[PDB]
Amino acid sequence: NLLVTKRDGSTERINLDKIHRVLDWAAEGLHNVSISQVELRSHIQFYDGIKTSDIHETIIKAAADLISRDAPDYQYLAARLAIFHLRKKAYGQFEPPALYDHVVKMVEMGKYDNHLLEDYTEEEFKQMDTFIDHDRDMTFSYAAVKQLEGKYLVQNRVTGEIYESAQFLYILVAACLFSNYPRETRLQYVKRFYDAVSTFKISLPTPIMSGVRTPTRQFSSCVLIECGDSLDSINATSSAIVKYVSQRAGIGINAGRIRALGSPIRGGEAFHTGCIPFYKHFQTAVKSCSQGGVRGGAATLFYPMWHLEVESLLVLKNNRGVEGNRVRHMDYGVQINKLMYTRLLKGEDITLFSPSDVPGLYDAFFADQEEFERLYTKYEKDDSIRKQRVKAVELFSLMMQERASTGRIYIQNVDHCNTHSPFDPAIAPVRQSNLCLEIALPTKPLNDVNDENGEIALCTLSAFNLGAINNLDELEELAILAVRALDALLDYQDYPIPAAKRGAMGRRTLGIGVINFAYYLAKHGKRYSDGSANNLTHKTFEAIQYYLLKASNELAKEQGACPWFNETTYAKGILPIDTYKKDLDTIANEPLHYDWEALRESIKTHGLRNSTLSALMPSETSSQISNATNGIEPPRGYVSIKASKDGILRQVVPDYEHLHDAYELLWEMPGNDGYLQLVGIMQKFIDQSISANTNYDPSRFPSGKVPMQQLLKDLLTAYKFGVKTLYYQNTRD
Amino acid sequence: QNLLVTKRDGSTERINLDKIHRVLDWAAEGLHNVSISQVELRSHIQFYDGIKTSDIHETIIKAAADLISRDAPDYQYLAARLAIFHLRKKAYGQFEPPALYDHVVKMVEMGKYDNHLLEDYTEEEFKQMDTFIDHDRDMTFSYAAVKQLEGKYLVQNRVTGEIYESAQFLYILVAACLFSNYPRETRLQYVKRFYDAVSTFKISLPTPIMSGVRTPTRQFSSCVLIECGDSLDSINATSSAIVKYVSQRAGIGINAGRIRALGSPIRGGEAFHTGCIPFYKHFQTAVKSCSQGGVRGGAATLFYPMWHLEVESLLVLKNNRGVEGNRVRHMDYGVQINKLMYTRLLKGEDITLFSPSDVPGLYDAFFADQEEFERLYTKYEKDDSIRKQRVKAVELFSLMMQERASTGRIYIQNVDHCNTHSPFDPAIAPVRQSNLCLEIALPTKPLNDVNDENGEIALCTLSAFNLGAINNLDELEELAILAVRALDALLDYQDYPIPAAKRGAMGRRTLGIGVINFAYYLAKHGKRYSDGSANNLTHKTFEAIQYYLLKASNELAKEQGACPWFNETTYAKGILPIDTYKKDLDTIANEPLHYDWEALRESIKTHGLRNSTLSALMPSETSSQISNATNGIEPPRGYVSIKASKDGILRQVVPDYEHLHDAYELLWEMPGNDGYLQLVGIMQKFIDQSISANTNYDPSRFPSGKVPMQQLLKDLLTAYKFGVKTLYYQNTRD
Ligand SMILES: Nc1ncnc2c1ncn2[C@H]1C[C@H](O)[C@@H](COP(=O)(O)OP(=O)(O)OP(=O)(O)O)O1
Ligand SMILES: Nc1ncnc2c1ncn2[C@H]1C[C@H](O)[C@@H](COP(=O)(O)OP(=O)(O)OP(=O)(O)O)O1
Ligand SMILES: Nc1ncnc2c1ncn2[C@H]1C[C@H](O)[C@@H](COP(=O)(O)OP(=O)(O)OP(=O)(O)O)O1
Numbered sequence A: 001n002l003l004v005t006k007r008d009g010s011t012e013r014i015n016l017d018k019i020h021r022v023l024d025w026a027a028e029g030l031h032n033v034s035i036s037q038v039e040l041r042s043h044i045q046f047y048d049g050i051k052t053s054d055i056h057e058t059i060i061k062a063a064a065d066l067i068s069r070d071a072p073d074y075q076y077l078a079a080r081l082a083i084f085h086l087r088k089k090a091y092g093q094f095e096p097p098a099l100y101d102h103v104v105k106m107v108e109m110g111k112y113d114n115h116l117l118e119d120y121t122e123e124e125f126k127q128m129d130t131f132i133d134h135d136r137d138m139t140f141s142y143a144a145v146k147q148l149e150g151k152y153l154v155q156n157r158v159t160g161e162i163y164e165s166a167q168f169l170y171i172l173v174a175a176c177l178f179s180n181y182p183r184e185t186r187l188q189y190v191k192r193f194y195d196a197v198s199t200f201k202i203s204l205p206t207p208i209m210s211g212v213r214t215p216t217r218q219f220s221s222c223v224l225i226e227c228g229d230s231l232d233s234i235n236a237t238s239s240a241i242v243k244y245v246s247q248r249a250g251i252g253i254n255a256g257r258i259r260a261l262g263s264p265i266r267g268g269e270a271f272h273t274g275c276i277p278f279y280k281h282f283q284t285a286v287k288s289c290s291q292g293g294v295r296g297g298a299a300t301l302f303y304p305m306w307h308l309e310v311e312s313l314l315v316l317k318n319n320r321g322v323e324g325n326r327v328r329h330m331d332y333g334v335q336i337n338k339l340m341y342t343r344l345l346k347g348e349d350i351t352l353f354s355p356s357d358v359p360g361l362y363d364a365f366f367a368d369q370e371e372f373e374r375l376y377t378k379y380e381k382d383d384s385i386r387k388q389r390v391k392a393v394e395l396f397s398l399m400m401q402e403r404a405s406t407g408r409i410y411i412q413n414v415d416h417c418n419t420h421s422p423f424d425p426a427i428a429p430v431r432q433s434n435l436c437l438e439i440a441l442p443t444k445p446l447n448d449v450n451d452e453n454g455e456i457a458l459c460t461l462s463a464f465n466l467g468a469i470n471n472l473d474e475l476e477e478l479a480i481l482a483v484r485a486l487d488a489l490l491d492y493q494d495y496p497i498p499a500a501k502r503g504a505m506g507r508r509t510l511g512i513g514v515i516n517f518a519y520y521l522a523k524h525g526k527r528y529s530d531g532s533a534n535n536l537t538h539k540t541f542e543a544i545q546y547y548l549l550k551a552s553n554e555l556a557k558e559q560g561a562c563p564w565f566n567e568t569t570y571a572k573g574i575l576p577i578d579t580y581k582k583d584l585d586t587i588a589n590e591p592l593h594y595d596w597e598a599l600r601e602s603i604k605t606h607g608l609r610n611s612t613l614s615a616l617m618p619s620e621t622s623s624q625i626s627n628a629t630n631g632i633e634p635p636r637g638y639v640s641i642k643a644s645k646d647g648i649l650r651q652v653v654p655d656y657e658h659l660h661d662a663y664e665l666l667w668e669m670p671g672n673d674g675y676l677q678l679v680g681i682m683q684k685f686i687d688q689s690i691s692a693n694t695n696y697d698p699s700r701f702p703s704g705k706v707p708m709q710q711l712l713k714d715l716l717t718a719y720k721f722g723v724k725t726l727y728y729q730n731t732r733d
Numbered sequence B: 001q002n003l004l005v006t007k008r009d010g011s012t013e014r015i016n017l018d019k020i021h022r023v024l025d026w027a028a029e030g031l032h033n034v035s036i037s038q039v040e041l042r043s044h045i046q047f048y049d050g051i052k053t054s055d056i057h058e059t060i061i062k063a064a065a066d067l068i069s070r071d072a073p074d075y076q077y078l079a080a081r082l083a084i085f086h087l088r089k090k091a092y093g094q095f096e097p098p099a100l101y102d103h104v105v106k107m108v109e110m111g112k113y114d115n116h117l118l119e120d121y122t123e124e125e126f127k128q129m130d131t132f133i134d135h136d137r138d139m140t141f142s143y144a145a146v147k148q149l150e151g152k153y154l155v156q157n158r159v160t161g162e163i164y165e166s167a168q169f170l171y172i173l174v175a176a177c178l179f180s181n182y183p184r185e186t187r188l189q190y191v192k193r194f195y196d197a198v199s200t201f202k203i204s205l206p207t208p209i210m211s212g213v214r215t216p217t218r219q220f221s222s223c224v225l226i227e228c229g230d231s232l233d234s235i236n237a238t239s240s241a242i243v244k245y246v247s248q249r250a251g252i253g254i255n256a257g258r259i260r261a262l263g264s265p266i267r268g269g270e271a272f273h274t275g276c277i278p279f280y281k282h283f284q285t286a287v288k289s290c291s292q293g294g295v296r297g298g299a300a301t302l303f304y305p306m307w308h309l310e311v312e313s314l315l316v317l318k319n320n321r322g323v324e325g326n327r328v329r330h331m332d333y334g335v336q337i338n339k340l341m342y343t344r345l346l347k348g349e350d351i352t353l354f355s356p357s358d359v360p361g362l363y364d365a366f367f368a369d370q371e372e373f374e375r376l377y378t379k380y381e382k383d384d385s386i387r388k389q390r391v392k393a394v395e396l397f398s399l400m401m402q403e404r405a406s407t408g409r410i411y412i413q414n415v416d417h418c419n420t421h422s423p424f425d426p427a428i429a430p431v432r433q434s435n436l437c438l439e440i441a442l443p444t445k446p447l448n449d450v451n452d453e454n455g456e457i458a459l460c461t462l463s464a465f466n467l468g469a470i471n472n473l474d475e476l477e478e479l480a481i482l483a484v485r486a487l488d489a490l491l492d493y494q495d496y497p498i499p500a501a502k503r504g505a506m507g508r509r510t511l512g513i514g515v516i517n518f519a520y521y522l523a524k525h526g527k528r529y530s531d532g533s534a535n536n537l538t539h540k541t542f543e544a545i546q547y548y549l550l551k552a553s554n555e556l557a558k559e560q561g562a563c564p565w566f567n568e569t570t571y572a573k574g575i576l577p578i579d580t581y582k583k584d585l586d587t588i589a590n591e592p593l594h595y596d597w598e599a600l601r602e603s604i605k606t607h608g609l610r611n612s613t614l615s616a617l618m619p620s621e622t623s624s625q626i627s628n629a630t631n632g633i634e635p636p637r638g639y640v641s642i643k644a645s646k647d648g649i650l651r652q653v654v655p656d657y658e659h660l661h662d663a664y665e666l667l668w669e670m671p672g673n674d675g676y677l678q679l680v681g682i683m684q685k686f687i688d689q690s691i692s693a694n695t696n697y698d699p700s701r702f703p704s705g706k707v708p709m710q711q712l713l714k715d716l717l718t719a720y721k722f723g724v725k726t727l728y729y730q731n732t733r734d
């Protein structure tokens, strides 16, 4: 006898079969799901005059709550119901409108960029509509749909109104990025790229997902700024930071050049008051566009281990201490090279300098290890040069102690970053990284915010979904699509600072990584910790880099190599396979399966469109769209639970039903040796770096605390295998 | 005696107490109520075999210095002269200084003096300048003065502590530099007259001039006013500008009132403002960017209007309570208030809070047009579409005065008084802020870049007349001529690290000349602060100051031309301070004008002024000690001030305590603030800019030992009633 209120506002007799009908539709092809159980939980909440929209949200939440290890398919049941809801919210019906009608309407509403209607005719939109398969929305998991509704789908932020659906997002991201291609190949590229992303072969970053098709041109999420040892450069760096954090980009700040506390200025007219007050200025710049401390501005600051103030800099993050000697809301990357590690192993000392007192020492630190050791020993014996001496063990232990307690003191092996690099260290050294330490690019300090001679490094990101490919040879096609799409974005996006545009147009650097690596290993019956994945990893990332290079090489044939290609090691006929850490030969004997020598000559002849191509970034948000495991990291559990605005979101690792025993969870691992080996093997082929984590469970250790010896052991293990950077240290509770 | 002493060259000889007695006799000459034997008594006991002569001398200096008291103030000169003697030997190897030319030549070679001294003056001119010098004027310093000379002013090597010059060389060369470009028919005449003025303490010069002018430096700017626009580009520019100037030890005044409120839409709603406070924090780290520790270092005052939407959060930025996220403790703040705000308080009504980004024309009118402000304010109060918040005026004022009382560093600027009674036309060049110490009031324009040529940063060159050293007010004619011309020449002399600042300085050529020894000046004439007995004398005195300053700048304009932006002044349209003062001053002062202002009015109409502003009453804590003057216009807290320092305890007696101890009115001997505030208001009648006015309270003089809010608000309104533009420190006795 009860009545429901329909979406139009009309009223009608309640019909439980209609709910049953929708649930049946969503349950097609699913295993171990019960329609009746969902109905049971939903029915009790029904009242006279209840809205149909409210009825639907009731069964969505009911289905979402039933997501478990025993019945993972509820993630697709709940997802499809959610998609159904979003269709109605955006279109007033399930079936989406014609693409051209949709685009026209959205342009009039100011939600889409008008250039879509200028670059494509109505007939071309009709044709693009035939590419679209809206039923691919039925392949999302529940967590994916929530990220779509929350972050990606074009919507009204005031009212929450959803304006588009997932396949429209995909096809128009494709249409925009390839809008400047000639008409003989354009729609072919659009279809092929649309297929790649909508079938989760290629994973796109958040700013591209939410932005590309809209009037915005802000797509840079990653920025590298080098600060010079001067007030002009400090101000310039600060201004650049403010500009880019206002666009919600993460910042990597090199401040290692800033001379130490007590250093003479202009011969002695004044004396330096220390690096720390300037760090604070950088911090407030990073947090200038943030309310509260929940998220907002994020930055990593880099400095050499041998800096005179290093003992003060290492402790900047811990809770204890006064405000005067703490800069807690930034992360830090300590820059280390071979000599430092040598001093550690030999139990000798480390001498601390101010870069302003050691001519050429700072440059050699990154570019020339032989010259560094010469100058370093030269200056250690010079008594006229201001210095301080510390026990190497004491210094490393302090670093690792703060890294353990905060988890946010990072390591960068700067020699590995330049001996095994796409760049000639004598011309364009890598002297820092980004926020998450996967980016390694050249920089030049600015003497003004609009300095035309400074260089700010940017990088456009994306990732291959290793769990979505059947054969490694699929990467040829996917690399062509990924590289061409991102290279087009470089000309598409805007640059708020000249020094940033100069780097992007000069080197055209890209950073393409992977997701679902853990699922990839379980599929092939391998694991992280036992070394059984070494050869598979070697084979996999050879193919990735080869096809990326091959794609960028062919793109250079067609449109020309990047203007600053001559500054690469690639330009001199050098490949990653020539300069990798030779210690990798002891842990992987997998042969090369591709003709690198043919590629070498083709690169020498035609060059590369992009100075860099590969970088292994972390991906939490991006990964959820594919229901992929996060980047190269092992999952902490079969089911992840995340509290949020719209309730608790559950997410099951891909194909738990068949691979529950095959997965190796994070805390099921003995130590870090296996994982670090895999990272080193990856780094053999990766152009830039990898966001590698270290993990420790105190329970696995006597007295329940990780001994320093184990920390230093893993640190040296990473360096041994040519690992460039170390990101988070996760400690289990 | 078996005892031996060690001489300066390293030789040793048998101790002779007569030599100590001889030096003591020399230093004690003309001094009364000092005992040589007592100094000898305290000193001799500390002597050991082989003691250095220098250490012997430092012993008798300290002995004499410790005997500085009310019963025997002349020990301040005994100790000082002994110190001078010591500094002579340290610099010259003997008591008598070398010839001026020989001295300059040596110092230029050592790189301690600027070379342009030898390029601008011939040897004969240096010989002639040496005849001006009276090194015996070193004998007139007090002990506190000499320590300040040794500590801050005398050209020295900071590494070794070596002293290279003496006071009269400092004075004569400051004169020589500032007047170096003057024509040869008048140049050396100007040099002598200025030297006489400063060495006999008529004119008091600021620290950066005292220590700087004659050395290779060109950094002399000590106060900077920066206005921040409501944009990232301007915020960046402001930040960069701050960093540059605090690196040159300058105090900063920051106007950040334009920055829109938390939650305000950006670009129509593409983003939303995250609040003023995070930007304030960035300004703070900029101010502190060149500072180690929290002791002194970078200093700044930040300004905002009382009706700003975030005002309730801004007012509490200094107090100890709260997390670090909502506190910006290491800057001071000036709350900007006008008549309408006070009206709402008196009528017990409400005050509406706005974001300047949502109220077109309101911010501009707040400073320039009070009638238009009231029209727009009430217009926007009735508009419901416009975002706003409402608070009871009493509650808002009480919150402000609450934080002002507890911290002492929440300041008030009456912006309507700052523009209706001003040397500037508010429609063209409004005064929209002040400086660190709330005495400077100059026009500013925001920057869109650190090197923006269309922005304007306000600068001001300071100095002060010593009211205690002049015999009659007509001496100010000569002194104003010297002061104005010396400072005006400095404008062309000093460097400008930022274009927007160079524009303001060269455009308006603004000066800030004040007074010191005002309390002693009152005591000399048998007047006091609190009973109203000084009202007419103050009127007489500060009419004379402003008239002679204007007269000097007017004549300087005849000779060298008016400042490029003179047409933006009220002076240019024939308006004088005597036309626009707060009319409530007539009820507390009936002193007539003694000078021909109408003749001056016409002469300014014809020839103009070289400087847009001339007068400002700054605090003088360091500057005053050279003259042994009472600080600025402030009453002394005691007859003898005890100040602990690195070099020991410095005792300083108020001038002529011997005869005027009953004539002085010490700070805590005062009933309230009314008398003082009336004097400030009367001063402000003639002062071009503003005055660093303090409010003082003694909890002991109040029931339950707590200063009631009613008194705080009463004094606030009293200040506004008599046209007071700004309120600096609030001092609370402990
Ligand atoms: N009469 C009904 N009684 C009970 N549940 C109903 C009824 N009609 C629809 N529902 C349920 C089915 C779904 O779980 C949910 C949403 O269905 P939906 O078709 O979008 O609503 P609607 O029929 O009011 O609008 P539309 O006009 O778009 O069909 O409401
Ligand atoms: N007044 C100051 N107080 C503290 N630190 C300062 C000051 N001025 C500059 N610094 C810092 C900023 C830089 O880290 C470093 C050098 O500054 P910089 O602007 O290059 O001065 P400079 O170019 O005039 O002299 P130098 O030859 O020593 O570099 O000292
Ligand atoms: N032989 C002495 N016995 C006792 N006191 C002495 C003796 N010589 C100097 N003094 C006192 C007098 C002064 O206050 C102080 C030294 O003053 P001073 O004349 O500058 O030193 P000096 O005589 O050793 O070197 P100089 O050759 O520069 O004069 O100590």
Ligand SMILES: Nc1ncnc2c1ncn2[C@H]1C[C@H](O)[C@@H](COP(=O)(O)OP(=O)(O)OP(=O)(O)O)O1
Residues within 6 Å of the ligand: A245, A246, A247, A288, A289, A290, B229, B230, B231, B232, B233, B259, B260, B265, B266, B267, B268, B271, B272, B273, B274, B275
């Ligand atoms: N992303 C941001 N987050 C927080 N505050 C911001 C952000 N961007 C700018 N602001 C501040 C700075 C200014 O006070 C104000 C906007 O000024 P501005 O930087 O000039 O932006 P705009 O010119 O592009 O837009 P508008 O037309 O709204 O001023 O808000």
Ligand SMILES: [Mg+2]
Residues within 6 Å of the ligand: none
């Ligand atoms: Mg229906």
Ligand SMILES: [Mg+2]
Residues within 6 Å of the ligand: A229, A230
């Ligand atoms: Mg420099």
Ligand SMILES: [Mg+2]
Residues within 6 Å of the ligand: none
């Ligand atoms: Mg002697």
Ligand SMILES: [Mg+2]
Residues within 6 Å of the ligand: B230, B231
């Ligand atoms: Mg703007």
